[PDB]
């Protein structure tokens, strides 16, 4: 099968940087509509089963990005809601973002992971591992911390996404 995994969240959290750690073949305007710019495709093996995974980084801020956020929600098989552990403001918006996704696909059970990125930036940390874990508990979803910069837990993130999807299948 083909799985479509969508990186979403506030600007600056590390969505594009996370996308780059997937190691996928990057799309472009020449391969629109199915592999546009800011998409990354790769065949991967998870738990002895291969899947073609397309990782999307098209969650654009502002009015001009509305149709892309809609396309993102309409077509995603799973959603990675990314905040930065160095940016409490991004963390604070996690529940609203999650509820918009859930409410926007009311007939579907949406596979989601809450991603606390920039875990390497110890000096700049504003949100704790514990806090992020607790909010995920509250919101009924899996939590993981990543350093997109160091590729720490990034294999686990994308493998986890595939697992999330398979467990509704």
Q: Is 69 in the site for ligand GDP (CB under 6 A)?
A: no
Cβ closest to ligand GDP, residue 52 vs residue 92: 92
Q: Is 80 in the site for ligand GDP (CB under 6 A)?
A: no
Cβ closest to ligand GDP, residue 20 vs residue 166: 20
Q: Which stretch binds ligand GDP (CB under 6 A): 8-16, 42-50, 64-72, 153-161?
A: 8-16
Q: Which residues in 128-165 are b (16+ Cβ under 10 Å) and which e?
A: eeeebbebbeebebbbbbbbbbeeebbeebbebbbbbb
Give binding residues as ranges: 9-16, 117-120, 148-149
Q: Which long-range contacts (CB under 8 A, 24 or more apart) does 87-91 make?
A: 87/10, 87/12, 87/13, 87/118, 87/126, 87/127, 88/126, 88/127, 89/10, 90/9, 90/10, 90/12, 90/13, 91/116, 91/126, 91/127, 91/131, 91/132, 91/135
* Residue 121 interacting entry, from Mg ion, ligand GDP, none, C-beta within 5 to 8 Å by type: ligand GDP
Footprint of ligand GDP on residues 101-160 (CB under 6 A)?
117-118, 120-121, 147-149
Residue 81 CB, shortest distance to ligand GDP, in Å, is 12
Dist CA 123 CA 146 (whole Å): 16
Site mask for Mg ion (CB under 5 A), range 5-34, x = bound: ----------xx------------------
* Residue 120 interacting entry, from ligand GDP, Mg ion, none, C-beta within 5 to 8 Å by type: ligand GDP
Neighbours of 106 (CB within 10 A): 7
Q: Which of 6, 13, 136, 144 binds ligand GDP (CB under 6 A)?
A: 13
Q: How far is CA 36 from the centre of its chain?
A: 17
Residues of the shown chain interacting with ligand GDP in the complex, contacts defined by CB under 6 A: 11-17, 117-118, 120-121, 147-149
């Amino acid at each position: 099968g083909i799985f479509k995994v969508m990186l979403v969240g506030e600007s600056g959290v590390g969505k594009s940087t996370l996308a780059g750690t997937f190691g996928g073949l990057q799309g472009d305007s020449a391969h629109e509509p199915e592999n546009p710019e800011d998409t990354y495709e790769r065949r991967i093996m998870v738990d002895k089963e291969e899947v073609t995974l397309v990782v999307y980084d098209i969650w654009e801020q502002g009015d001009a990005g509305g149709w892309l956020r809609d396309h993102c929600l309409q077509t995603g098989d799973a959603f990675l809601i990314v905040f930065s552990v160095t940016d409490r403001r991004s963390f604070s918006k996690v529940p609203e973002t999650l509820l918009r996704l859930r409410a926007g696909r009311p007939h579907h059970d949406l596979p989601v992971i809450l991603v606390g990125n920039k875990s390497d930036l110890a000096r700049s940390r504003e949100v704790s591992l514990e806090e992020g874990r607790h909010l995920a508990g509250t919101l009924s979803c899996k939590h993981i911390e990543t350093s997109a910069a160091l590729h720490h837990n990034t294999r686990e993130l994308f493998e986890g996404a595939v697992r999330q999807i398979r467990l509704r299948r």
